Design a protein around this ligand. Structure first.
Ligand SMILES: [Mg+2]
Ligand SMILES: [Mg+2]
Ligand SMILES: [Mg+2]
Ligand SMILES: [Mg+2]
Ligand SMILES: [Mg+2]
Ligand SMILES: [Mg+2]
Ligand SMILES: [Mg+2]
Ligand SMILES: [Mg+2]
Ligand SMILES: [Mg+2]
Ligand SMILES: [Mg+2]
Ligand SMILES: [Mg+2]
Ligand code: NA
Ligand code: NA
Lengths: 71, 71, 143, 102, 152, 66, 182, 130
RNA sequence: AUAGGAUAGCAUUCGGGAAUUCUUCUCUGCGGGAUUCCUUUGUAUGCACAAGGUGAAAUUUUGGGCAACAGCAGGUCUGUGAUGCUCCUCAAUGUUCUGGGCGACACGCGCACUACAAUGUCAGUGAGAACAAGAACGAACCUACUUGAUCAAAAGAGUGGGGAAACCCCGGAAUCACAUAGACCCACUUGGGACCGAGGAUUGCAAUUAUUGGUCGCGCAACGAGGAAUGUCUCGUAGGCGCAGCUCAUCAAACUGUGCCGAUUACGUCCCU
């Protein structure tokens, strides 16, 4: 039913870069729901933001990634 | 669920009748006396006999009991 | 100087952990040669670590504790090692300290958790025939 | 010197213990060094068969067990002395084997 | 400082550091140095017949060689059967119940041969494999570098 | 709103299947209230014993004696 | 040198209490480092009321055939759930869990036609935990959302009495039916 | 994986008369071709030099031609004989790898051969039995 | 550290050499230990009970085995050189040998196994059980190590060891764990693995998927949680997970045991049976 894109577009990408930060709770599933993208590329984008200090890693496991906005 | 069967009760009554002067209100010393003055293949049976013998001594403190005859 | 060494054991299911605690130049606790901070998962490390934190780390100041654990699985081995470490601290204080300090430590341990010093006696119940394990019976059908 | 090992095995616990005790006493009378006796792990032989002949009724089983006890004693004595120590009327069902260790 | 040495402790040996961190650093060293022999069949086979797919990691042979080196460190005198037990898995058998399958001995033999060619592993006295002096030195030096968090 | 009641005695398990307990509960109210020390018989499901506490949605209904 | 335990070394037990007075003696607030405490909690009837509440939550996540006995997995799921709850509510997640367990069960029920009965506090706690775990498990069955996210959403909604909670909806329906069967 | 979608992205990719789903990763979209499984798809990607983390539909025409030429004749690209699904053809004796419609056609040929010769496998397949 | 959070300490390690010393852990023949023993409540004479204590253990300690008297036209004449009476008895209903069959199905039922997926499937790394079995000058039997290997698996070959607390073996089981910064992202899909094709090897005197492993294909076979009904179960239990033995030249979706991870609920009643 749902159509989750498997690649970033320009619009969904700057939405990830600008709107995903300042979310209080950030997970790949939440960002996938908001941006209508697959959880894999959502996780990749969140990892990219994490590398660049845009977001803060709160809880981490091999299968679970929880992020939050920077204070 | 700890009823004393007639074997244990009969043995305890015999023990109290024959060895009244060697018993007291203590289970452990009475157990030693009973191991000395009885024959039985069962350690658990001797322990139950000692328990009911101590009960009989405690009762015999507060007046006579049925089935025990002493001078 | 004297040796100042005691040996204790802990048990949980079929896991047997032997803890050798020795007065050393520095606190050092290892389980099967692995330091405490390297033990995984963090839940089982937290279980083992609470043999130290419930009494406080100052009572392990100059003690080297090596725990060799065999048998059981990961959870049971962790619990056995935890019990062995707590009992080893108690035994060391019994051997080389007053009774007041040993009693204080023992009451703290027993207040937190009884199985820190007393072994859980539970064991696997043997299987019976006509059953698939200790208690579940063969499926019955009528028609 | 040289070590001689007696391996005492039997399926009757009382018989194996009696033979082991008698050997211990005889060796102590000879003033020889003794290692043991070591009570080796007891092995249980299990045969679990259906109780019924044919195949009718609730599938009930019999569990037959046979337990084997083994003891070993080491004597620091010559072969002649060990042969002297083991020369007595042994309880039936007890197997005593003599072996020289290296 | 996080990497500060806990007072009166100095240096590091194996078992003092994360096993995976050590294996990753050792595999990185093997790949970067470029002297380890990698069989061409590593790029075609599965690591075991109990797996259903290829190892999915391009550096899987280096990681396996590092893990085998660490295993030989932990157990001197281990042969390919022991390593097969260590690297085994549970197999999917379809509609039949699952069973444990030991790892294929062949890749473990290849890994031990590659480690031997580097001088890190030698035949053990009375069968098996064991670390050389150089292998032990390499293992402990890598353990210290991991403790220091350098990784290259 | 729910009033809090204190179980002061267990009168016994009621019902055919024994899943209900008949208890005497005292309404734990402030002094000077009409329901102060007021006691009432209530049917209770779940494991309960003396000195447990209940949340009475209604305090006007009494359970029929058993 | 001995300090009070904090759950997963970060969540404080200090001041942890339930607002529901009738559930005061059946929700355990003893400090613990992890949910895992291998104790014999089912030996006596009410001994399970002393088990720490987060461990009772962990025991509720072990239900189906695929989840039977996976207690370390449940502890990890709860570790992530508490972080998500803290991000959502900015409160102590232990307090949120306690409040959800307080509000997640009906106070009046119906039994066999049917008569309205009252629910013992022990059953209130049991049913709250059971219903929250059931709703979280069923919400995550075929869903992008992970199990910790669903569990955190369910617990946060139950702590506020929101009808978006599965447990709150079930409790409201049960209580309404029981008021109908007075 | 942090790469913006190309303007030539294809939701349906045509490879050996097969409709390959572009959203899938390349080896798991290659397994959509009959005669190509997961192992074979990974090996073909490794022989073609294309990254397995890319999505199909981003594959250009030359990449698809190279992949098709590898799948058609895997032995020419040093893929071992034991990796192929028809190693000594009972009629021709040659080793090959059947892909796409040739899998079904060769299955039809095998069944007709076992049926015309009246072997037990052939007559059982005639009856449809297991 | 690609950024590397949280989590005790403020000289350590090396089952690939010796020397003493000792029994905490392991081994075990006979012992000890628990009994309503102690204290309160309701019973209220006794017989007891419920909470708590003591304690490794607190009520048939826990789990088994044994288990009276009466019967059943219950099963077995397919266990026996257990058997009465009847049938066959040289082209035999005796006994061998050859080849089929006991396995055939668009069918119904009982008991399992595998699933329907993200509390997951794949790839990696880590730590880690317990019952057990091993052969009939040598030779069967079980194994380790090496090799095959200058290139897949399964194999095939050597050299050793073990009569089994000695070798296997420090028994690296699978559930499990992983801050692996791995792939997949809700779809009959990298779920599922039925059905089937081609090569090859192995047990056996003899094997066309109907011996059995292994490789690549097939997967576009259902199956997305299952109607009326219905089974089992109260603590190291259910469930889940493997392992061993037994059958066994070869083959466990079975049984008999074993350990591992480990709960929910009740501690009641006579509504149903
Ligand atoms: Mg492993
Ligand atoms: Mg599976
Ligand atoms: Mg399967
Ligand atoms: Mg299974
Ligand atoms: Mg989900
Ligand atoms: Mg009949
Ligand atoms: Mg005949
Ligand atoms: Mg899992
Ligand atoms: Mg599929
Ligand atoms: Mg699959
Ligand atoms: Mg069978
Ligand atoms: Na049956
Ligand atoms: Na296959």
């Amino acid at each position: 039913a749902l159509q989750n894109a498997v690649m970033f577009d320009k619009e969904t990408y700057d939405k990830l870069r600008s709107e995903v930060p300042k979310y209080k709770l950030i997970t790949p599933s939440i960002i996938s729901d908001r941006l209508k993208i697959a959880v894999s590329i959502a996780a990749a984008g969140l990892k990219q933001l994490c590398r660049e200090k845009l977001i803060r890693l709160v809880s981490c496991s091999s299968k679970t990634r929880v992020y939050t906005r920077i204070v | 669920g700890k009823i004393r069967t007639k074997t244990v009760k009969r043995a305890s009554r015999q023990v109290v009748e024959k060895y009244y002067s060697k018993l007291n209100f203590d289970f452990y010393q009475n157990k030693r006396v009973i191991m000395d003055v009885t024959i039985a293949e069962s350690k658990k049976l001797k322990n139950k006999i000692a328990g009911y013998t101590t009960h009989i001594m405690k009762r015999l403190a507060r007046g006579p009991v049925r089935g025990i005859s002493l001078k | 100087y004297a040796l100042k060494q005691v040996q204790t054991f802990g048990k949980k299911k079929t896991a047997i952990a032997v803890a050798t605690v020795t007065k050393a130049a520095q606190c050092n606790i290892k389980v099967n040669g692995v330091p405490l901070q390297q033990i995984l998962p963090d839940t089982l490390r937290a279980k083992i670590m609470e043999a130290i934190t419930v009494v406080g780390s100052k009572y392990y100041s100059r003690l080297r504790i090596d725990v060799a654990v065999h048998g059981g699985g990961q959870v049971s081995q962790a619990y056995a090692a935890r019990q062995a470490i707590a009992k080893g601290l108690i035994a060391f204080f019994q051997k080389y300290h007053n009774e007041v300090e040993k009693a204080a430590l023992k009451d703290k341990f027993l207040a937190y958790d009884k199985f820190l010093l007393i072994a859980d006696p539970r064991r696997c119940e043997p299987k019976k025939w006509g059953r698939h394990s200790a208690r579940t019976r063969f499926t019955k059908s009528y028609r | 010197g040289q070590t001689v090992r007696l391996t005492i095995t039997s399926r009757n616990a009382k018989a194996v213990e009696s033979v082991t005790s008698q050997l211990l006493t005889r060796a102590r009378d000879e003033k020889v060094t003794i290692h043991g006796p070591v009570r080796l792990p007891t092995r249980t032989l299990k045969i679990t068969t259906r109780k019924t002949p044919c195949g009718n009724g609730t599938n009930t089983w019999d569990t037959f067990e046979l337990k084997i006890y083994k003891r070993i004693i080491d004597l620091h004595a010559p072969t002649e002395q060990v042969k002297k120590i083991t020369s007595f009327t042994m309880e039936s069902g007890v197997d005593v084997s003599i072996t020289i260790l290296d | 400082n996080k990497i500060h040495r806990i007072g009166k402790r100095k240096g590091a040996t194996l078992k003092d550091v994360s096993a995976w961190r050590w294996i990753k650093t050792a595999a990185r060293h093997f790949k970067q140095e470029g002297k380890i022999f990698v069989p061409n069949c590593t790029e075609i086979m599965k690591s075991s017949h109990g797996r259903e797919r290829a190892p999915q990691n391009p550096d899987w042979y280096y990681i396996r060689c590092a893990a085998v080196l660490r295993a030989i460190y932990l157990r001197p005198g281990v042969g390919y059967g022991g390593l097969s037990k260590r690297f085994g898995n549970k197999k999917n058998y379809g509609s039949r119940p699952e069973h444990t399958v030991t790892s294929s001995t062949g890749p473990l033999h290849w890994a031990c041969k590659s480690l031997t060619k580097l001088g890190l592993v030698e035949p053990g006295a009375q069968s098996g494999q064991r670390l050389t002096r150089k292998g032990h030195k390499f293992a402990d030096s890598l353990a210290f570098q991991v403790q220091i968090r350098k990784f290259g | 709103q729910a009033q809090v009641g204190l179980i002061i005695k267990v009168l016994g398990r009621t019902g055919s299947r024994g899943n209900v307990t008949q208890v005497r509960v005292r309404l734990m109210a402030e002094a000077g209230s009409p329901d102060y020390n007021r006691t009432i018989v209530r049917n209770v499901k779940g494991p309960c014993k003396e000195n447990d506490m209940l949340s009475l949605m209604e305090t006007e209904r009494e359970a029929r004696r058993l | 040198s001995s300090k009070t335990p904090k759950l997963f070394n970060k969540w404080s037990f200090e001041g942890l209490e339930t607002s529901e007075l009738a559930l005061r003696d059946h929700i355990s607030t003893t400090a613990a480092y992890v949910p895992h405490t291998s104790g014999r909690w089912q030996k006596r009837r009410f001994y399970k009321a002393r088990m720490p509440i987060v461990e009772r939550l962990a025991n509720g996540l072990m239900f189906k055939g695929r989840g039977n006995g996976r207690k370390l997995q449940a502890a990890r799921l709860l570790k992530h759930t508490l972080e998500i709850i803290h991000l959502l509510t900015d409160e102590n997640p232990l307090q949120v869990v306690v409040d959800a367990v307080s509000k997640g069960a009906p106070r009046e029920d119906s039994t066999r036609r049917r008569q309205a009965v009252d629910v013992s506090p022990m059953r209130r706690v049991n049913e709250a935990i059971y219903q929250m775990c059931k709703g979280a498990r069923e919400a995550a069955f075929r869903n992008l959302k992970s199990m910790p996210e669903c569990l955190a959403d369910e617990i946060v909604n139950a702590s506020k009495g929101s009808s978006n909670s599965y447990a709150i909806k079930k409790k409201d329906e049960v209580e309404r039916v029981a008021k109908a069967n007075r | 994986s942090l790469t913006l979608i190309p303007d030539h992205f294809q939701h349906i990719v045509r490879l050996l008369n097969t409709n390959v789903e572009g959203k899938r990763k390349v080896p798991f979209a290659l397994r959509m071709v009959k005669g190509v499984g997961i192992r074979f798809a990974y090996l073909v990607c490794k022989k073609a030099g294309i990254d397995v983390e890319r999505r199909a539909g981003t594959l250009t025409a030359e990449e698809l031609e190279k992949i098709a030429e590898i799948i058609a004749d895997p032995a020419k690209f040093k893929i071992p004989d034991w990796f192929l699904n028809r190693q000594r053809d009972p009629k021709t004796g040659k080793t090959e790898h059947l892909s796409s419609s040739m899998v079904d056609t060769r299955l039809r040929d095998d069944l007709e051969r076992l049926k015309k010769m009246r072997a037990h496998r052939g007559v059982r397949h005639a009856y449809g039995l297991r």
